Amino acid sequence: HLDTALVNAGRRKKYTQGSVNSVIQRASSLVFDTVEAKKHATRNRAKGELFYGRRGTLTHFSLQEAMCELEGGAGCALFPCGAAAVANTILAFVEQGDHVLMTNTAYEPSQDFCTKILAKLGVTTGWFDPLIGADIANLIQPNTKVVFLESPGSITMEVHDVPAIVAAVRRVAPEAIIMIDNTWAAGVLFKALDFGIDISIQAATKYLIGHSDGMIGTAVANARCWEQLCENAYLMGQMIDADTAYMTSRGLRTLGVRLRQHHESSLRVAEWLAQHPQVARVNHPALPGSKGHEFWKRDFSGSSGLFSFVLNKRLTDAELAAYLDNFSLFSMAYSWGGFESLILANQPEHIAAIRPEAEVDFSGTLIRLHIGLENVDDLLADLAAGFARIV
Amino acid sequence: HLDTALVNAGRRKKYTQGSVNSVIQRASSLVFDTVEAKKHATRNRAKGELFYGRRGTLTHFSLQEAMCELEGGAGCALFPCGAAAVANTILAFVEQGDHVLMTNTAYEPSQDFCTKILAKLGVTTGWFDPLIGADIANLIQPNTKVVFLESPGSITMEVHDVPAIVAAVRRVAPEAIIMIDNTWAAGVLFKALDFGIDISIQAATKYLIGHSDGMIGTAVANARCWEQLCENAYLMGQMIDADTAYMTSRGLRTLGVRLRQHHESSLRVAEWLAQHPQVARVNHPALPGSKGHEFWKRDFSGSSGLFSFVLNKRLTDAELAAYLDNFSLFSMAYSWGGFESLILANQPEHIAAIRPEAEVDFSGTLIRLHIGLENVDDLLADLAAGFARIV
Amino acid sequence: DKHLDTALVNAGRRKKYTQGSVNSVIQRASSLVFDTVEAKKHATRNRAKGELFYGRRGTLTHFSLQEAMCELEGGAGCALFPCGAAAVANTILAFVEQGDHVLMTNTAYEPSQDFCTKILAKLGVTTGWFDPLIGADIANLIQPNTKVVFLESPGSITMEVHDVPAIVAAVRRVAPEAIIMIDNTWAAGVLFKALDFGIDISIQAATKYLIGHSDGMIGTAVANARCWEQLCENAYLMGQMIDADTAYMTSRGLRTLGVRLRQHHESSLRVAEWLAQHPQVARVNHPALPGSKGHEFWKRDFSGSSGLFSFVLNKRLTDAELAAYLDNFSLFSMAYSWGGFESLILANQPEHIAAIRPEAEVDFSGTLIRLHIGLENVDDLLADLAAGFARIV
Amino acid sequence: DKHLDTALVNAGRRKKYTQGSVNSVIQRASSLVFDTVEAKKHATRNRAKGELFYGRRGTLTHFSLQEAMCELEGGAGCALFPCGAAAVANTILAFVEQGDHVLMTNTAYEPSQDFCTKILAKLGVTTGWFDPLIGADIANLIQPNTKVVFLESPGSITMEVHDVPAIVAAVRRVAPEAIIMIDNTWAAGVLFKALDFGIDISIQAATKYLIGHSDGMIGTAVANARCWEQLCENAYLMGQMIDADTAYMTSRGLRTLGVRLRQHHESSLRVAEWLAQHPQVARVNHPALPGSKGHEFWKRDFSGSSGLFSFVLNKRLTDAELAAYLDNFSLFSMAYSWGGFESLILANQPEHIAAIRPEAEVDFSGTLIRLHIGLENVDDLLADLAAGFARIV
Numbered sequence A, B: 001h002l003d004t005a006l007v008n009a010g011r012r013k014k015y016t017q018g019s020v021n022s023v024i025q026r027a028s029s030l031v032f033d034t035v036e037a038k039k040h041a042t043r044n045r046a047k048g049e050l051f052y053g054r055r056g057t058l059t060h061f062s063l064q065e066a067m068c069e070l071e072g073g074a075g076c077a078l079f080p081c082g083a084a085a086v087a088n089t090i091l092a093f094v095e096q097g098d099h100v101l102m103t104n105t106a107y108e109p110s111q112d113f114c115t116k117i118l119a120k121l122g123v124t125t126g127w128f129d130p131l132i133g134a135d136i137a138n139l140i141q142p143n144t145k146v147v148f149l150e151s152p153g154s155i156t157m158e159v160h161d162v163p164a165i166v167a168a169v170r171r172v173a174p175e176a177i178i179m180i181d182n183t184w185a186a187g188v189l190f191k192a193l194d195f196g197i198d199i200s201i202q203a204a205t206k207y208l209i210g211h212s213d214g215m216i217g218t219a220v221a222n223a224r225c226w227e228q229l230c231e232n233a234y235l236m237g238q239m240i241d242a243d244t245a246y247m248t249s250r251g252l253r254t255l256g257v258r259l260r261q262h263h264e265s266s267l268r269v270a271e272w273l274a275q276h277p278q279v280a281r282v283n284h285p286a287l288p289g290s291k292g293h294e295f296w297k298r299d300f301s302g303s304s305g306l307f308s309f310v311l312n313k314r315l316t317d318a319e320l321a322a323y324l325d326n327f328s329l330f331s332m333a334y335s336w337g338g339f340e341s342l343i344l345a346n347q348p349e350h351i352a353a354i355r356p357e358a359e360v361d362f363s364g365t366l367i368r369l370h371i372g373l374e375n376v377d378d379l380l381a382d383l384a385a386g387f388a389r390i391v
Numbered sequence C, D: 001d002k003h004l005d006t007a008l009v010n011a012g013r014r015k016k017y018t019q020g021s022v023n024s025v026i027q028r029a030s031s032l033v034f035d036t037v038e039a040k041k042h043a044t045r046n047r048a049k050g051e052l053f054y055g056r057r058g059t060l061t062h063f064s065l066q067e068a069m070c071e072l073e074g075g076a077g078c079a080l081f082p083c084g085a086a087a088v089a090n091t092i093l094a095f096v097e098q099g100d101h102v103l104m105t106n107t108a109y110e111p112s113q114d115f116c117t118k119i120l121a122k123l124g125v126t127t128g129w130f131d132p133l134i135g136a137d138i139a140n141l142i143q144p145n146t147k148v149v150f151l152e153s154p155g156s157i158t159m160e161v162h163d164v165p166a167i168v169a170a171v172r173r174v175a176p177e178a179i180i181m182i183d184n185t186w187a188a189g190v191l192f193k194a195l196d197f198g199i200d201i202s203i204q205a206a207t208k209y210l211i212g213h214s215d216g217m218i219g220t221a222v223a224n225a226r227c228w229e230q231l232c233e234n235a236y237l238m239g240q241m242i243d244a245d246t247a248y249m250t251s252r253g254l255r256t257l258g259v260r261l262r263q264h265h266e267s268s269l270r271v272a273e274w275l276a277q278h279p280q281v282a283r284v285n286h287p288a289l290p291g292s293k294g295h296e297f298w299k300r301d302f303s304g305s306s307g308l309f310s311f312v313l314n315k316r317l318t319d320a321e322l323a324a325y326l327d328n329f330s331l332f333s334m335a336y337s338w339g340g341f342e343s344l345i346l347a348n349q350p351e352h353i354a355a356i357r358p359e360a361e362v363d364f365s366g367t368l369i370r371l372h373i374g375l376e377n378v379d380d381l382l383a384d385l386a387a388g389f390a391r392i393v
């Protein structure tokens, strides 16, 4: 059961040394008692023997073991944040002349890494609609090396048909590297590697940390792709500090109870918004009628608390301020996955500008909500008060 | 005076909020009270206004201000470790078709980033002897974009003639990006940017942290190069956690008193080794006769505690174990810059393999020492006991 | 009902403490700098009133936690301590002097009892005991020199729930000026609103559910207006404080306390209901289980349950049987403390309990097993308990 | 001489605590897991002897610090506390009972005095006072019920150095069983080897030089074999402990303590020598300065100096002059505490000192300025002091 696995993942005596949680081992230098010990550590420098702090200490090894168990992978690479995990995981598998095929709903920093970093290094990026399904086969080029998924999509929440995409990729380019940004699912509500994806990337910053106070990225790879991910990310110096690794392991322990509350509350809010006269559409993977909902219901084991909705009109700048500046419980901030409820707004042309080679299908102002752990009736009252400020 | 600057750098009330040290602000989400506040934060997202944790919190801003003051730069980018700072700082300034010209004594992970990451991205790397001086002009190609220095060199400690190198580069390619790995000097014993270098990179892991228990990289850039460094490293997701940033600021406060002890002790050990019958040569920038010593004496304001020496013979594997396995105070580990004294050995062919397009000029076993804060007569007794095990 | 969830998310989070982040900043300090003599004078006058003065009085991080605890427990001030045992010992010490008498429940946490019998006694302060179900009959035990009446509901290990209204009313009838204190750790200070019942001070080992992850230690004591000044100043004369980082982690634990406690309640009551039907169980002590001692008071006076409870086996396990039972669990771990995400198991023989029930005997003869029910899947925990039963059948 | 530098680098760093790193691991815990009943029994028997048992007794991180402190101060055990004031109050409390008497130097840290007069007095323990230079004449003040003789050398604020050998010899002549304690904070426990002088317990605010950076609070008390058991168990009954992270940071501070103290000594003595020649200075109180009170004992009994000292101005500054002086320093900051990298300044009027010198009067009439000399360049600090003098001339 997932709840039991979350409580126990990565907690072995060699890391915990008698406590419930792993020790925090802060180190660059790791000491070798003999030349033979140093030789053994060198051979096992990527295999959980203490060698050098850039490879990790006991605290990192415990987190890596936990992530491999929970996401069903052969190895887990750690990064300073989610954006670093995305950028460096893609970079690890490309070279001049390669092509990346990325969903047009990818997180904007992921897109900007492709267009502003990869392109000048001779790696091209093409784009696809998140509902393309089996038709992605027609976009695979002779030089396509990476297929990059993100389900649900950033902001607009469209859910891919991963089985159809993976089957189509494997028909044309069996050896391609299929990656997913699996942050919304916290890597546990969608078991990406069981669907034939090669690498599951997360901003552990979000639900794994769970409290809006650490930043960290993870990438869990299958056996085919692990060695290349591990060694190439290491050549870029990617690692996380021991204390944040500890706080990520610690966040896992409450992830199940947190996610269940985020699901229950956010679906309640989504159902209520969907009936509301000031709401044109609700984008929540768990809400019937949302884009790709059928695939969410089939392929995921739950929901988190992040979603969006489109207002029945385009707010003026004055209305945007009246709406956003006067919430009592929702806070305006970037990021999500914590205990606090958050709100942000985007105009349609803002979204169109981050949907490469595509237009948007709405004209009202889009509101993205993160539903935290507050009482849902209090959150509904805050949203209702906001509606009254713009009616 | 440097000691007063080290105590005070980055400590302004807006970061310290009443304490001696900056507060530790742990955050991904940073809250905007109004739409206008969010617009202001966005405009100032790289200029010390709270915007998003990947850009930094008050704790990072304090460290960045300190590093800019101490190294005389326009901005300071932060990284998860020194290797990440090197890799990402080079990457920030190259594209397909560019050429990098790097000292053949560069830190081995820096070389491996160039040969294993850059090359397949269409960026070539050429090499130069660290004593090339003005003759580097003959190696500058039409596509040379970056000139990468490291003074003293890794392991073998050769000191560049930076004024001669910089003048020759500026004669041929005034616009080239000149970078230095300035870790041995802790960025303060050699004021790189005052010599016309564009970017000074450090593994803050070493002397800035000072205790072998944090990892972090920094890169301080002049005004010409800052915006590109800042934005391109950010697109790779590079950052450090708030707690390590705090521990780096904290390490600065004792850096002066620590470095003076490392200098005094390590020069004493070097002078003693230089008289010893079992020692063929001593590689210490502060020791008369060492390679580039004249430039160290002219261009640096002190020494740290890392150096090497060559034994009067090539140790067999049995002798290596007898020597290294039985020290009482020196420990075998990678890294350096802490309070503990460390020892490592390399055979000549090991060094030759990390001197691209060059051979080594010694045949004895090379021993690298980090001289910590222990009593120097105790360290000398430990070294003497080691000599007796191999005589 | 989830009534408190919004309060838990927001408690103590004011801009002066968070400075733009969601959580309070961590301000590590002994020295706190005064920019001017005028500022030093103001900080001195207000050194116990939330102006930065000296690290021993607190930094912004402590002030934020103190505000959150006062809001959640409805107090006038919150004193902080290195652990729950320090909170108990120092809160009692803050209100006693030579010649005074303490009246304490005989189900009090053992370190609390030992503080009374081994420290207070040699300082001229005597301690008497009462059965946890004494209710209004406590009036007969109050002496003219009784200064402190010390409650703990549910009781340690055996889980008996006081009739707090009856006890408080009797104390106020006989000794209105007495200081009534409660160790409110099991309720995490929020499932039983002690200060609303006329208790003067609610003490918690924040170590347990507030931290919630078995990795910090900290005590809190929230006092009403009548008692705050004496608690604050006398604990400070003993140098009592907590470090800023643990204060931050306690505030952080508050944010998930509601969702955690609901799961601990649901899972532990399921386990208790199953044990109460099991042929190898003689008795189940869970405040939320009908028939448990003081359950009617729990039902009336609490807003929920946590996950700690106990049960009595049908026999006293020998040392050998205790090893066969405890050494071979797959999910439960043997450890002290509780309140975390992990399920824990500990055994107490009946004679061990009797020795920590002063002036009383136990009313059971089997080994008592104390369970902390964590966040694991409850069916997996039941399978672990069932396997344990098979090892001792 | 740097004799202790190797010991400071290595103290407490054993493989069982460091597990491959240079520094001890940070083990955060309340619960400590017992794999078997046999392991729990062994941990219980050895719960005060460095076996993992419960977070309140310590984790590996605490054990490493305790080992380092016992090595450096030459003791049998080291008890840990939330701050220096908690160490003083709880170490004294651990050895007194109703009817006992404490004999304390009148230059003791004010919170230490207030603990005696405001806490101990109401528990039946009386306190008497002695001049710090009393030496062998202390014998006349020892009563049949004197249980504790409490030293502090140099004294707080005014810096008087005891003749510890003379005091100890007199105490052992009259009351051999008395518990002699010293607050050894100024020496960081290493510049004065208190236990080698026949003192029983050396107490430190590790907050100061051991932490060394003004950002952690922690008290330590290192006891000889005679007194360790009572200190350990009675402090534990008061719940006294420190968090694992602050213990780690204290161990970490030890590693640079030698290099820091040498700079504090060099710089502060230079400043003291300059002040002693300054026309606006009436007196300099620095143990390392010839002519200072008890300097001959400092020279004989200490292995070095720290950076805290004081001086008396040629006049008492009014409130207005105090602001002009203190508000406008560029490098010195106004704050309590000391022992860090930053230079600090605080003023005490002569009448303020007299009020904290029980049964004594002060022998100066100017404002007393206490300086902590940090790691800044000493010529810059002298320029800051010179500018201050110009503002009050």
Ligand SMILES: *Cc1c(COP(=O)(O)O)cnc(C)c1O
Pocket: A080, A081, A082, A083, A084, A086, A107, A154, A181, A183, A184, A202, A203, A204, A205, A206, A215, A216, A217, A335, B028, B054, B237
């Ligand atoms: C938050 C976000 C990221 C980036 O993570 P950071 O830790 O903020 O760098 C990556 N992917 C998704 C889907 C995100 O929402």
Ligand SMILES: *Cc1c(COP(=O)(O)O)cnc(C)c1O
Pocket: A028, A054, A237, B080, B081, B082, B083, B084, B086, B107, B154, B181, B183, B184, B202, B203, B204, B205, B206, B215, B216, B217, B335
């Ligand atoms: C240590 C080292 C680095 C790498 O720093 P890390 O923090 O270990 O990644 C970079 N440059 C030099 C010269 C080094 O010695």
Ligand SMILES: *Cc1c(COP(=O)(O)O)cnc(C)c1O
Pocket: C082, C083, C084, C085, C086, C088, C109, C156, C183, C185, C186, C204, C205, C206, C207, C208, C217, C218, C219, C337, D030, D056, D239
């Ligand atoms: C745990 C316990 C305490 C002691 O708390 P510590 O933080 O471990 O000192 C106090 N009261 C109760 C009811 C406890 O169970």
Ligand SMILES: *Cc1c(COP(=O)(O)O)cnc(C)c1O
Pocket: C030, C056, C239, D082, D083, D084, D085, D086, D088, D109, D156, D183, D185, D186, D204, D205, D206, D207, D208, D217, D218, D219, D337
């Ligand atoms: C600072 C001080 C103390 C108190 O230490 P805290 O950690 O601040 O409680 C004790 N003794 C002396 C001599 C002091 O100066």
Ligand SMILES: [Mg+2]
Pocket: A351, A352, A353, A354, A355, A356, A357, A358, A359
């Ligand atoms: Mg578009």
Ligand SMILES: [Mg+2]
Pocket: B351, B352, B353, B354, B355, B356, B357, B358, B359
């Ligand atoms: Mg070569």
